[PDB]
């Protein structure tokens, strides 16, 4: 086992403090911050990968083990001249000197480089956690130069605890969080106050009741709103807290994650609830939330709380991933905008396993691109992706990377874990080359675009999504699986003679069989199906398909539902006025993604066919999971 | 089992003639019928509820009020169902509807414990935790909506059915009737105190005495406003890790125990200057019980408490009115490096107090040394050498009586009350037991320190400081002592008010020429003497020597400087206090803290505190090091 000298190619600049997100006359603001660079030459941005996004207005993670080597060649790129300064900043020796100027002053465009072995001294023990938490920051003006805006998170580590992957995950998964309540009678403001918000309407406002950021500014970051982007988290995969509270002397933050409880160590282990932040105290804590669904970190002390701290975190189950729809979709959803032509025309067709020869994408383009409106912030886990086959020719695209937008207008590229600087995707090999590839960590995201880095004949696509709701639990109930026993169904009334019983116990998405799926002795339109949960559940919707009887085609073609919670009263459900008129089968088989507005919470669920095809013939499947149990 | 609590949400009239919230109920409904547990120590309190590791409590709130009010917990687990917490976490329909109670409402509550929320192998029996309400976070809480909310492991109903604990809540919390429910004229909104018994008010009841109290301390605010709570035992738990005072911030609850002497209705401070007037206070009966039906050392101090003079800037110098610095110090004309008359205790050889103790020039204004293991007997023979009468009292140890006899001086209710005028010596003894000392946890040496107590800081603001430090049980024997035990070094963090020194306009007829306009009571001139230093050295006077491979203890503390806190600094270097590694030092008023640290980061640092608000203000010094010899 080895020892590493890990540089950190990093510098110092500015943009600033954007707001625009629902709650258009924003500021402008122009605070520094520090960026991490690709080499000595100090070009590439070195792009803030999906991963670690959560970081944001601060600066990037530095990191290292116990026996290691910590390194920082650094350029000011600035007006006032600022500093790379923490604890463990270990100089060395002594010189001919005058008093000792010890003095660390960075100078624009000047390259003040520094590096020294990391002690036990930094490091954590084995009483306490797998890391440990420290800030660097600018010591030019500790007072200044933290609210301007160079603060900064620094991790040391047990050996035996990175990777080649860079950073760790053995179970890990990190975040910072940063909170501070910025203000500006500090760092060049001045280049603000008269640089924008005045020209010739000024004159309002000097230093009384104009607090500009005792206006606003209530950090976790300062994307520090009322939301802060990077929250990712799998719902197991137990997460690492970093609070380090900084700024002033009323700076104090007592954090809590709602609904959520947390360890702490120190001399042991003892669990806690919510954590007083001081300015100084770099707080490691762990937890596993095993509570699914879309969270919130909230500086609890009520001032604080009312102008910005509620700043949203996301738990998603990876048990959850379900085809996004491709054959089971949108007829002709979205496609591109001239991105794409081949008279066999683009996405309109362009799906997973579409038989035929008019079949898929086609454009021989050297800058291409396919784009998918979910109709909805999602969660995409990854791509089912495939190619097409012509006259006798094996066409496909062969590499691909993959960009996202949450919205429409601002896109980016995409960083799938600690790749490099641009996540690149393998694509087919063949003309049946389902190359499934999955998102490292996932995608939040409304649209996708996917563009080839090369191809075959032509740039030529078909493809599937993989994922699922922030938790609508877009997940099969247990029809298909059978986890809903056959007793645990009863119909209003069954086919039964002596070729058939056709049972409601039947009713299974795909079942083979002699009598195999549920039909109603005769037939009505008041008549119902009705699962029994044996517990509390909440719904996204039901999916439905006929049966092939060998005999002729059957299936429904328009029905109700149904909801209860005493399982013998029954509450029906509802559009924005009447009832729903459902969009039913049209075929022996093919299922439908049919889905409901308001997620219905209920135990007892029926269907409630209206119009059929020959006889009402129902091979079904409920979609969902569970709130709390009955009460 | 299975957990049921039916009770809902009041509006409320309240008292100690002033001021009336809304509340949180405690009764039997269906409907709207009385129902009280409440008689003590229950203040405005929503029923403390318990549950255990693995239960499921089911609060169903009926709302009855003019505001829209919402229940939320901490510290345990719920569904999206449940939460009770406004804002857009997705949440279809029947989700929101927890979030908030529209006003004159009724919602169930689905309440969780897993074994992800129990509490830690090894820590407080029962966890500290409180039910808050949010819908408007400041408003639903300066109102008087909070309850306790208590968890811990498989055996309550059961192990408390068959077990005996004394256990109150105590509710250290600062309505602001400003920031309530509700808004020539002259007479504007307040209150800021314990349980809601304001000013001075009591509440209520006590426990046993032969054994021990537990309680649950729930810290409370709708701003940034730190306390610092005690009264008499020394209230060891925190973990087992073993503490000075309870010291309480925003948010804030973890859960502590302490034993008893007798009948003593104990005193019960904020002990700060700010929250003191307005502040918060209450007893304790400590009553006869209904469930019957290489030795000790013996240390010597002949100290005297004696007028000389302080510059607090000697060595550095260089004002005008240059700098915020330039204007410290007596703002007529009289203005340079900083010269006051002082009052410091000071040590002399023997009983003829005439042997100058050669002097600390590194403690500055800090009273001796003073050190006693558990086990230890002090003796400390005291002299008054001040005319305006002092005394000598020790935070840290209880058992402080007058040497030979266990009278009280003929008159007073015990010796931090007035004794000692000028000319007459005082025999004290001082004897240190386990329960003031460390532990099996803690450091080996708590910090801790000597004020005197005719008047408070009328007082100390005047010089009376020194470092007493209470120890672990060791003599060639128990550990680290072989070689060497390398020596014993105090740091003291002292902002001193001048303006309130026993020796006030005593020193403006002095230093200060002339009072041929003798102006007083101003906006600058009262900030001209509040003098935030470090040992009395000041703006990086007389700062340390030391050198590199040295390893040793620090011992600081906060003392005088106060309303307000000290995160502190020292430049590149990290200490090892609570045996983790922190950088950061934060300290309070009553601030005992006991660092460690490894000496090997060579050159100027410049130790100070990590609030730059003060560190201007002068309280700032420097430290030096370089290789040695031996
Ligand atoms: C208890 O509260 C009352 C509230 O009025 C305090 O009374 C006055 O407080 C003002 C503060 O502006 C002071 O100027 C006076 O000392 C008080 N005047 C009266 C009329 O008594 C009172 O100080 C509090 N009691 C305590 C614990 O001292
Ligand atoms: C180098 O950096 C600083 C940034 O403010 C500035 O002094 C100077 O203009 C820069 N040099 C260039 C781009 O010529
Ligand atoms: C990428 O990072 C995530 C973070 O937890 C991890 O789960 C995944 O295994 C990593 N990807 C690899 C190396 O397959
Ligand atoms: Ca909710
Ligand atoms: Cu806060
Ligand atoms: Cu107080």
């Known amino acids: 086992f080895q020892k590493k000298t890990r540089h950190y190619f990093i510098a110092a600049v500015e943009r600033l403090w954007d707001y625009g997100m629902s709650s258009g006359s924003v500021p402008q603001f122009k605070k520094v911050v520090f960026q991490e660079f690709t080499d000595g030459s100090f070009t590439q941005p070195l792009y803030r990968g999906e991963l670690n996004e959560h970081l944001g207005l601060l600066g990037p993670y530095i990191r290292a083990e116990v026996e290691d080597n910590i390194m920082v060649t650094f350029r000011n790129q600035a007006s006032r001249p600022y500093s790379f300064y923490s604890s463990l900043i270990s100089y060395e020796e002594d010189q001919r000197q005058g008093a000792e100027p010890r003095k660390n002053f960075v100078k624009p465009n000047e390259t003040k480089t520094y590096f020294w072995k990391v002690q036990h001294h930094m490091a954590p023990t084995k009483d306490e956690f797998d890391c440990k938490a420290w800030a660097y920051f600018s010591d030019v003006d500790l007072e200044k130069d933290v609210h301007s805006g160079l603060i900064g998170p620094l991790l040391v580590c047990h050996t035996n605890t990175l990777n080649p992957a860079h950073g760790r995950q053995v179970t890990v998964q990190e975040f910072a969080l940063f909170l501070t309540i910025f203000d500006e009678t500090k760092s060049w403001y001045f280049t603000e106050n008269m640089e924008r918000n005045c020209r010739a309407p000024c004159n309002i406002q000097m230093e009384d009741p104009t607090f500009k950021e005792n206006y606003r500014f209530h950090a976790i970051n300062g994307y520090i709103m009322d939301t802060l982007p990077g929250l990712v988290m799998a719902q197991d995969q137990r997460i690492r807290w970093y609070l380090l509270s900084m700024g002033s002397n009323e700076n104090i933050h007592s954090i809590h994650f709602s609904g959520h409880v947390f360890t702490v160590r120190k001399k042991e282990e003892y669990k806690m609830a919510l954590y007083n932040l001081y300015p100084g105290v770099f707080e490691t804590v762990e937890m596993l939330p095993s509570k699914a669904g879309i969270w919130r970190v909230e500086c609890l002390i009520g001032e604080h709380l009312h102008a910005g701290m509620s700043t949203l975190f996301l738990v998603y189950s990876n048990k959850c991933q379900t085809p996004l729809g491709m054959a089971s979709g949108h007829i002709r959803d979205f496609q591109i905008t001239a991105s794409g032509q081949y008279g066999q025309w683009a996405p309109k067709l362009a799906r997973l396993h579409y038989s035929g020869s008019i079949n898929a994408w086609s454009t021989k383009e050297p800058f291409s691109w396919i784009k998918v409106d979910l109709l909805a912030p999602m969660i995409i886990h990854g791509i089912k992706t495939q190619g097409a086959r012509q006259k006798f020719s094996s066409l496909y695209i062969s590499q691909f990377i993959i960009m996202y937008s949450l919205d429409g207008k601002k896109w980016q590229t995409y960083r799938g874990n600690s790749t490099g600087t641009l996540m690149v995707f393998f694509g087919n090999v063949d003309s049946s080359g389902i190359k499934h590839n999955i998102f490292n960590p996932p995608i939040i995201a409304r649209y996708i675009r996917l563009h080839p880095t090369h191809y075959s004949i032509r740039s030529t696509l078909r493809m599937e999504l993989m994922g699922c709701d922030l938790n609508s639990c877009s997940m099969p109930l247990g029809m298909e699986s059978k986890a809903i026993s056959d007793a645990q169904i009863t119909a209003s009334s069954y086919f039964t003679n002596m070729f058939a019983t056709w049972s409601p116990s039947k009713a299974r998405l795909h079942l083979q069989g002699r009598s195999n799926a549920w039909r109603p002795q005769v037939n009505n339109p008041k008549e119902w199906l009705q699962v029994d949960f044996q517990k509390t559940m909440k719904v996204t919707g039901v999916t439905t398909q006929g049966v092939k009887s060998l005999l002729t085609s059957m299936y429904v073609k328009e029905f109700l539902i149904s909801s209860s919670q005493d399982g013998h009263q029954w509450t029906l459900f509802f559009q924005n006025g009447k009832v729903k008129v459902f969009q039913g089968n049209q075929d022996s088989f093919t299922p439908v993604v049919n889905s409901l507005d308001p997620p219905l919470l209920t135990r007892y669920l029926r269907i409630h066919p209206q119009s059929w095809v020959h006889q009402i013939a129902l091979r079904m499947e409920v979609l969902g999971c569970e709130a709390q149990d009955l009460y | ?630």
């Not at chain 2, 059961?158 to 105590?170: N, P, V």
């Not at chain 2, 469930?291 to 013996?298: A, I, L, M, Q, W």
């Not at chain 2, 502190?568 to 601030?591: A, I, R």
């Not at chain 2, 420097?622 to 031996?630: E, I, Q």
């Open chain 2, 1 to 630: 089992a299975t957990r049921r609590y039916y009770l809902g949400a009041v509006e409320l009239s309240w008292d100690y003639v002033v001021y009336k919230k809304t509340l949180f109920v405690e009764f039997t409904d269906h409907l709207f019928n009385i129902a009280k547990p409440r008689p003590p120590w229950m203040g405005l309190l929503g029923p403390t509820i318990q549950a255990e590791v693995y239960d499921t409590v089911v609060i169903t709130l009926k709302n009855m009020a003019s505001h829209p009010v919402s229940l939320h917990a901490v510290g345990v687990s719920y569904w999206k169902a449940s939460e009770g917490a406004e804002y857009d976490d997705q949440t279809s329909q029947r989700e929101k509807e927890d979030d908030k109670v529209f006003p004159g409402g009724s919602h169930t509550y689905v309440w969780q414990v897993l074994k992800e929320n129990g509490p830690m192998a090894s820590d407080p029996l029962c966890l500290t935790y409180s039910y808050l309400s949010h819908v408007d976070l400041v408003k639903d809480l300066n109102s008087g909506l909070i309850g306790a909310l208590l968890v811990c492991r498989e055996g309550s109903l059961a192990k408390e059915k068959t077990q005996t604990l004394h256990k109150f809540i105590l509710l250290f919390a600062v309505f602001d009737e400003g920031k309530s429910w509700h808004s020539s004229a002259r007479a504007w909104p307040k209150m800021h105190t314990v349980n809601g018994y304001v000013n001075r008010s009591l509440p209520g009841l006590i426990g046993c005495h032969r054994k021990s109290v537990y309680w649950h301390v729930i810290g409370m605010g709708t701003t940034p406003e730190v306390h610092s709570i005690f009264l008499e035992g020394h209230t060891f738990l925190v973990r087992n890790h073993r503490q000075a005072s309870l010291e309480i911030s925003p948010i804030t609850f973890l859960t502590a125990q302490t034993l008893l002497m007798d009948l003593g209705q104990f005193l019960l401070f904020c002990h700060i200057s700010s929250h003191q007037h307005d502040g918060m206070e209450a007893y304790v009966k400590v009553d006869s019980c209904p469930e019957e039906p290489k030795h000790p050392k013996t240390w010597v101090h002949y100290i005297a408490a004696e007028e000389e003079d302080w510059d607090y800037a000697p060595l550095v110098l260089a004002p005008d009115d240059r700098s915020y610095k330039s204007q410290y110090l007596n703002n007529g004309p009289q203005r340079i490096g900083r010269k006051y008359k002082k009052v410091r205790f000071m040590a002399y050889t023997d009983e003829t107090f005439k042997t100058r103790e050669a002097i600390q020039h590194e403690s500055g204004i800090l009273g001796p040394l003073l050190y006693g293991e558990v086990g230890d007997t002090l003796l400390i023979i005291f002299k008054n050498q001040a005319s305006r009468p002092y005394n000598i009292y020790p935070h840290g140890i209880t058992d402080v009586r007058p040497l030979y006899s266990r009278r009280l001086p003929k008159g007073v209710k015990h010796l931090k009350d007035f004794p000692i005028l000028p000319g007459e010596i005082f025999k004290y003894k001082w004897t240190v037991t386990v329960e003031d000392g460390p532990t099996k946890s803690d450091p080996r040496c708590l910090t801790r320190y000597y004020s005197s107590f005719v008047n408070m800081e009328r007082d100390l603001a005047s010089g009376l400081i020194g470092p007493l430090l209470i120890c672990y049980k060791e003599s060639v024997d128990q550990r680290g002592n072989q070689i060497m035990s390398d020596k014993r070094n105090v740091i003291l963090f002292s902002v001193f008010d001048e303006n309130r020194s026993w020796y006030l306009t005593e020193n403006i007829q002095r230093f200060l020429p002339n009072p041929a306009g003798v102006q007083l009571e101003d906006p600058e001139f009262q900030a001209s003497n509040i003098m935030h230093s470090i040992n009395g050295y000041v703006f990086d006077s007389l700062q340390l020597s030391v050198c590199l491979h040295e390893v040793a203890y620090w011992y600081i503390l906060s003392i005088g400087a106060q309303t307000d806190f000290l995160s502190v600094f020292f430049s590149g270097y990290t200490f090892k206090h609570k045996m983790v590694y922190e950088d950061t030092l934060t300290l309070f008023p009553f601030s005992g803290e006991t660092v460690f640290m490894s000496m090997e980061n060579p050159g100027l640092w410049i130790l100070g505190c990590h609030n730059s608000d003060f560190r201007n203000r002068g309280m700032t010094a420097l430290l030096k090091v370089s290789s040695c010899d031996k």
